[PDB]
Structure 1
Amino acid sequence: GSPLAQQIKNIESFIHQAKAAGRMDEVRTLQENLHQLMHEYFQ
């Protein structure tokens, strides 16, 4: 429920939706941001 957890959950939703039909195979900006957040939250 913390803000970092919320931001990770938000990004994950954006990644999955961006990989749905008719959209993308790559989500580089999102993955870069998720990677950064993972290091912030998983201490």
Structure 2
Amino acid sequence: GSPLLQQIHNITSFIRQAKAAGRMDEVRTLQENLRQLQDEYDQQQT
């Protein structure tokens, strides 16, 4: 739970910063990293 949530918080922040700097490749790969970790977090709780 909580450690995974920390990772999720951090990738979410990195996506915000990458969008603000107009770095598209970085945004798209990080969005896929986030999507995979969010499913892992949800399944562990589900």
Q: Fold match, TM over 0.5?
A: yes
Moved over 2 A (4+): none
Aligned alpha-carbon RMSD (Å)? 1.6
Show the counterpart of 1:6. 6
Matches within 5 A, 1:1-43: 2-20=2-20, 23-24=21-22, 26=24, 27-43=27-43
Q: Distance in 2 between matches of 1:39 and 1:24?
A: 27
Of all paired residues, the percent bearing the same amino acid is 71
Structure 1 portions without partners, runs of 5+: none
Q: Secondary structure at the match of 2:10?
A: helix
Helix, strand or coil at the partner of 2:9: helix
TM-fit CA distance, 1:33? 0.2
TM-score normalised per structure 1: 0.79
Q: Which runs of 5+ in 2 are unaligned?
A: none
TM-superposed CA distance for 1:29, in Å, is: 1.1
